[PDB]
Design a binder for this molecule. Sequence first.
Ligand SMILES: C[C@]12C=CC(=O)C=C1CC[C@@H]1[C@@H]2[C@@H](O)C[C@@]2(C)[C@H]1C[C@H]1O[C@@H](C3CCCCC3)O[C@]12C(=O)CO
Lengths: 12, 244
Amino acid sequence: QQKSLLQQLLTE
Amino acid sequence: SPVMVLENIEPEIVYAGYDPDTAENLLSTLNRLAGKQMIQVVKWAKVLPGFKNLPLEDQITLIQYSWMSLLSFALSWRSYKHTNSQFLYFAPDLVFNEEKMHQSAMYELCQGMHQISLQFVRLQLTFEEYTIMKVLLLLSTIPKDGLKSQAAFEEMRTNYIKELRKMVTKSPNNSGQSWQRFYQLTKLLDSMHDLVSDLLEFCFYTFRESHALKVEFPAMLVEIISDQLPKVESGNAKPLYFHR
Ligand SMILES: C[C@]12C=CC(=O)C=C1CC[C@@H]1[C@@H]2[C@@H](O)C[C@@]2(C)[C@H]1C[C@H]1O[C@@H](C3CCCCC3)O[C@]12C(=O)CO
């Protein structure tokens, strides 16, 4: 439904 | 040599923020601690040689499969360094062992984690060995039908295994027993699959029955377990062994 915390941390 | 990089990128210690002294409050506190630790695990993996170059999808898959092995392994290291493995050093403000557990299942999970820590005392595990073994645990479980960049993963895994073997076998501290030691470290990594299987089964239960049991999970774990649980349940999880 939205970007995961795991994905956001890996791509920030 | 990734060993030099590994010492540099090592996460710092996080506090639990402990207190009512009940099972549901202990479990909720531990789960919230796991969420803080997970932030430092992801930042550690982000700047990890080899892993940093896999597709985003593969990086997510690997972290979701191995988050438990990473946290229980780091817990065993802290327990060893700070208490000589007498207690489980969850955080500086949350230190205990099996003797504080009254429920049979909770005692056994606590004991299983303590037994890994005691194996660090028996081996006199060094920081160098620990950091490579920690990387090998991130690369210990893959999807049944493999990853997107399966070959690149296999290359990086074989390289980390070789870095462990060369480091152990070439050290003068292990003369006369270096191969025996290497095989003890690889057996300890295989035995991590057995412990983690049990910690995950209790975790999946407390997650499914979270509301009924009053066991709280942070957002990081809610999202991770939500993706991991259907993969594990469907048999889409291939643990990689050294001696099995
Ligand atoms: C990841 C975890 C957190 C911080 C840490 O430093 C190390 C770990 C590894 C073990 C991780 C831990 C926490 O989430 C709590 C977990 C997930 C646990 C495994 C499960 O088992 C029980 C244990 C906790 C110790 C005493 C016996 C019961 O708690 C867990 C659970 O299911 C609660 O819902």
